[PDB]
């Protein structure tokens, strides 16, 4: 368990799931799909990547 310290190292912070952020992202994806279809006159396909 004992390790030497390096000032140029850092750790992670577990998991911070944000379901509300994902819902906001999906709603924004829908709105942006509509906007891009309106603008470019062609139907786009927007896929929300993993946060």
């Amino acid at each position: 368990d004992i390790r030497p310290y390096d000032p140029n190292t850092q750790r992670r912070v577990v998991r911070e799931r944000l379901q509300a952020l994902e819902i906001i992202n999906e709603r924004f994806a829908r709105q942006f799909r509509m906007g891009l279809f309106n603008l470019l006159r062609r139907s786009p396909d927007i896929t929300v990547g993993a946060i």
Binding site: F37, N38, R41, R42, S43
Partner: protein, 110 residues
Amino acid sequence: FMEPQSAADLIRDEHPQIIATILVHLKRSQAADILALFDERLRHDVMLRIATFGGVQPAALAELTEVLNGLLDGQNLKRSKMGGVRTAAEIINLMKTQQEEAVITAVREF
């Protein structure tokens, strides 16, 4: 009064019966152009549905017209006749003999 591909993709995101009704209500040439751009399955389904079209209620027609009006975009001055191919040929004719040799080369290449 719109481009075939744009209208095809627009009505492609609709129920096939609605697509068939719109195509029946559209111009024959425009509908034929739209149907040529559809996939085989959708095209066959539309052709089957058109062969068994029995009329639509006026309320449904009004709602469909309102939805189509809502789906409209900045279609004012849609498309524009500027040039292409012929203009490219004219430009090639104005470019040097060595340049037109390069032209034969690249055009054969594509």
